[PDB]
Ligand binder design. Sequence first.
Ligand SMILES: COCCCN(C(=O)c1ccc(Cl)cc1)[C@H]1CCCN(CCc2ccccc2)C1
Ligand SMILES: COCCCN(C(=O)c1ccc(Cl)cc1)[C@H]1CCCN(CCc2ccccc2)C1
Ligand SMILES: COCCCN(C(=O)c1ccc(Cl)cc1)[C@H]1CCCN(CCc2ccccc2)C1
Ligand SMILES: [Mg+2]
Ligand SMILES: [Mg+2]
Lengths: 450, 450, 450
Amino acid sequence: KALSAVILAAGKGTRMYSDLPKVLHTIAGKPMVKHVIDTAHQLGSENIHLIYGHGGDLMRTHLANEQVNWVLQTEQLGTAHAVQQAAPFFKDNENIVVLYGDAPLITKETLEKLIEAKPENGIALLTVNLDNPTGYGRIIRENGNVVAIVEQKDANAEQLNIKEVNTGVMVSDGASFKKWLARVGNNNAQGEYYLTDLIALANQDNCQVVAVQATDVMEVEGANNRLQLAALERYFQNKQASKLLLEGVMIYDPARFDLRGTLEHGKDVEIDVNVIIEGNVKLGDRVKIGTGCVLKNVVIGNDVEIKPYSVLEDSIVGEKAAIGPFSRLRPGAELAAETHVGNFVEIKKSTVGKGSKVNHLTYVGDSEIGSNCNIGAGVITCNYDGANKFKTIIGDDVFVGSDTQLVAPVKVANGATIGAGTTITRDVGENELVITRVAQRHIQGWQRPI
Amino acid sequence: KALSAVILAAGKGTRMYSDLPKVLHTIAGKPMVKHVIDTAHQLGSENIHLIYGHGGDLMRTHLANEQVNWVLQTEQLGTAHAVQQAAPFFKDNENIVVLYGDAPLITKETLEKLIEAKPENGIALLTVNLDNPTGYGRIIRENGNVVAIVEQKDANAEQLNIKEVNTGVMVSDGASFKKWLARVGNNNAQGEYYLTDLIALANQDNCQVVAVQATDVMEVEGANNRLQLAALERYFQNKQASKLLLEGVMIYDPARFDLRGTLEHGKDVEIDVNVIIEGNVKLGDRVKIGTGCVLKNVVIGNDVEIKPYSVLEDSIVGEKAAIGPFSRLRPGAELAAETHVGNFVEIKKSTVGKGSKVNHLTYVGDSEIGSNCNIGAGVITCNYDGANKFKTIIGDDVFVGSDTQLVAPVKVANGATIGAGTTITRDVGENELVITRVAQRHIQGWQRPI
Amino acid sequence: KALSAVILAAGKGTRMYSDLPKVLHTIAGKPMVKHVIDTAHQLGSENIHLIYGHGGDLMRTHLANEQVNWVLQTEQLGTAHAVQQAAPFFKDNENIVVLYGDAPLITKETLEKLIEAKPENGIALLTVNLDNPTGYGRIIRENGNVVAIVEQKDANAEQLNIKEVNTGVMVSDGASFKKWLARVGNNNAQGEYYLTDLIALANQDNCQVVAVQATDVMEVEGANNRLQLAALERYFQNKQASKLLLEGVMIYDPARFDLRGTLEHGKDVEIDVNVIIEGNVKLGDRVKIGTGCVLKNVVIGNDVEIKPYSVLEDSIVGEKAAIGPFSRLRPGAELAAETHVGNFVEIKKSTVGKGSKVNHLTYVGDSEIGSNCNIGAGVITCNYDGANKFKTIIGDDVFVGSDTQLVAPVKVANGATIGAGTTITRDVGENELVITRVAQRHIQGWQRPI
Ligand SMILES: COCCCN(C(=O)c1ccc(Cl)cc1)[C@H]1CCCN(CCc2ccccc2)C1
Ligand SMILES: COCCCN(C(=O)c1ccc(Cl)cc1)[C@H]1CCCN(CCc2ccccc2)C1
Ligand SMILES: COCCCN(C(=O)c1ccc(Cl)cc1)[C@H]1CCCN(CCc2ccccc2)C1
Ligand SMILES: [Mg+2]
Ligand SMILES: [Mg+2]
């Protein structure tokens, strides 16, 4: 049968000490709540009802593109009240899963088991085994069904030794939710309407509640503060790294690896320590990434080596290229196959053709460079003091001598040769050699202050 | 009542294999003994008696400014002998706490409890629970008082199972210390005068000894070698990071964060992996620090982003500035609000005014740059081959073309424009355009070696 | 008596998802099998028989220089069959130790104990204690001898609680191996000839089998996939770091330190976080290495400080030199004592004499620079567009002004002074001052687009 999700995401998150609401804090570069939305979508949820409240305007700006029903809750009166805000939209004969926007690590796999376990007209409750369950609601089983959730303050001696506790995550059909939520009261020390009370209500109705245990405690943990958030981040990154290792990516140290997006990879890829991969990154076969590299939204071809401390963003690199160390590729950098980019080089919105080399102390911006060019150390593309910024076009087989300025807009045709120290303002023709005529004064017998 | 401290700091630290004495090795950038001095000061110690010996001259140079009584011990004859060196300076009616200079993690909070627990004319002894107490002196309690410390070699079967052991840290009044230290003997296998024996002596006198348990084993651990020192360092850094996380600083990975000094922070600060903060650093609201940055003695204003692999020292950065990646700020760099400093740029002892940009492959030293200037790629401030190094003064709204050398001392007035490739030796006036007249030789039909 | 080793190294390593065979994957920069070859050599092995198969051509290219007997196995029919391939080469009266090429952490010390424990005409079997021994062959002891290895599926209730299990590593004399290997059958579920069966065969012969327990589980672990490989890497790096710490090297964080080769060190060396040491590196007394440095095949003299994010390869650095931050030394860089190399500087195949400074935004390649030279910011050595690349020779006490190009081949004699912005193509004589005569156009009243 069909499925929809309710995600509880209204909290202020006071102990984050932030201007953001609780669920917008990121794990692996995306809001905690976005992790939960994605998991709900992967489960096959038809609708996702997002209960929100605090930091409402920020929620709407940061999650503007999410396919959710925006359910604006004006007051937090407990979890049952929050779910009831979405209940008018539940289909009678769809399953509804309730999830927490501050618990981003919950897995598709655990939730599939939870859904499959739900008996007709009953509830599947997600539980977790703790070595120290003190403070948490104990699961009481009679046969294979949950007959009660007994809170710490009510439990007798034997019940206190129960390690299985309630997580608050559960699945039931939409009609059952509508019926039982209307029967939840707030007669308790907090004066809140607790979703937890659905278990008692289901048992009152001779409906079955079945428990499913989470495989991992971290799977169900939420973050109330940034220390807990960092714990979630580390667990998530380790799990991501472990998956990649098992797929055949050599990550030298999975504790010093960060993925904040998606990684597509070939075979025999090697990633050294302290690499950060962000956005959508594709690495071909036998790509080697050296220590300290940052790759964001990049495509790297087969057999490329990126040497240490290279930072690349929104760039494409052709097969057998060599980049780094200390190379900077800025958005729109497109390096062809067999190119070479070296230390203290910055390439921005430029194409560099096959076999060309830009190996030192150079800025190339808004440029087209052809194949088998030699761009000398200290070369800079620049503009006049004007309005917009124009293009430098360099053909194939061009030699550009060291410390030359290329002043856009300018074109240098195939086979041209430019001497060191030149200022190029006029177009250079095919097979034209341009050399600067210097005037020097030579003074003999100049004794240095020494 | 008043309090003074005695810190035992005379050791050679042979297993460090160092020319330094034991307690001068650093944790978080400061000598282990300095941690203990500071803790003693925070407890409210009136006097701090520093028992020193080995590496005496180094102790005096490295701790020259510490408010301690320098008690030079000529021979190490045991801990009681060391404390007795300071005893002539104890006030009869002040409390004295004994601390170890190689155990830097001891907390103010534990020591406050220790002091409060001390009965009149008695001793408060700091103890610690170990899962494997083998080798350590077992605490024997009768009622709530310590009647003996039984060493491993003397303990019977049941005593060996006692997990509570002696740390050697204790508090008693000055008069009691003077009396009991004079009664300590050295009749034991080591031939040493042990401070430990004060417990037996107090019990001989019908004085009460009360135990206080350390909350953490690491709190009382000392470092005898650099492996142990690195364990202390990691524990300390984790604790510092955890405190900052709970205060609302987003530290992406607390295991890859180092603070070696003090950090003042606003709200919503984000610090990526492998950042080192040294000296006194102040970060405003919503500061973002990218991976691999090193900040030492810096003030950063609100809304500044420091991009990866930037190294800043003794510098000030105004609000909404953007620094990095691969930027270097050297001492005396002062960047105004809304400034931009980019890759492979070095700024030393220079002021850069509001809105100005220095984005590539540039050295600016000993300079004043005004507001809304454009400092082109490859620009260098330099000097004549002379004696001292002079200043470059650039006004507001100046454009400096790429690969220009500014030869100090020189002044460039408001609104001036300098063409690329220029050598500026003479002052440039207001609204003056300076462009280099190049002489080039053009040779047609130059066929490259290809 | 003499010793030889057999190393099992034929596996495909399917779950690595690699074009390499299993044992060529690296730990600390060298193939797993090379670790085991080296350990075998350190034990005093006269012959090392390398059983290989899958990825045969790669094995031969990657291990071409190893002193092993290459035993090419055409089919994997079990571990006994593999060892039997080498058996014709066993001396009757030498001991033979059997090792696994995918278990690189096995120690010399454990193996020495194993060998010493072997009774005449018997076997010493390496075992390991596991908290969860499920799936592994249980060691049955009667007296102090191993009478059986009982597999999981055969063990009774009490045998299943045995924590001691078989590793498959063992020592016996060559004649015993020849005899017993010929009696191993393949009547089991896998249809394989198991080396394990030698224990049963020895007991059949009234020969003694003695167990020796591994000190560490990780010591005997193999890597079947890259997740396991990364676990081995981390354990190995920690152990290496711990050894260095105990020798007196201050490694600020041993979890963020990598050694991939050998390190020779003096006293009071300090290594900050995220340093990688590769190949053969020698550091003198009081060398300080800042964060993010990479040193490969380098010799560093006493009292050198390498500041953060410096990358050095195949280079020598004299005493009291200062390198970094953001410095690049490429192969053949030789820096004398008291030299200074600064940010965004690249030195390649060049010698730099005592006291000389190259502090910013410079490339020096194929050069000899003498003592007490001042190489200004933006200086570049370059070549004509030609064939091979020629040498720049700079004498002692030379000043090279900022943004000067030195066009090889060229010689600059002692005491020469070169003005900023110069292009040097002709040799400069002793005490010759060369300054560029610029032509500038000055336009007054140029109002900037503002
Ligand atoms: C008093 O200590 C409080 C705080 C104790 N805890 C934490 O601080 C913590 C919270 C979140 C993370 Cl990610 C890491 C640690 C953990 C300690 C381990 C058990 N869980 C709770 C597991 C759970 C999750 C959802 C529903 C029910 C139970 C809380
Ligand atoms: C034989 O193993 C020796 C060495 C055993 N230990 C260490 O090597 C060690 C020492 C210091 C650190 Cl920071 C980390 C480890 C630890 C193991 C855990 C207990 N403590 C001692 C705790 C203590 C501290 C002060 C007073 C009394 C007890 C020593
Ligand atoms: C079902 O879980 C399988 C996998 C379980 N294991 C692993 O995945 C693992 C394997 C290798 C490493 Cl380095 C780290 C972990 C470990 C878990 C700990 C015990 N050992 C085996 C120890 C051993 C080594 C050699 C011979 C005999 C025993 C395997
Ligand atoms: Mg230049
Ligand atoms: Mg120039």
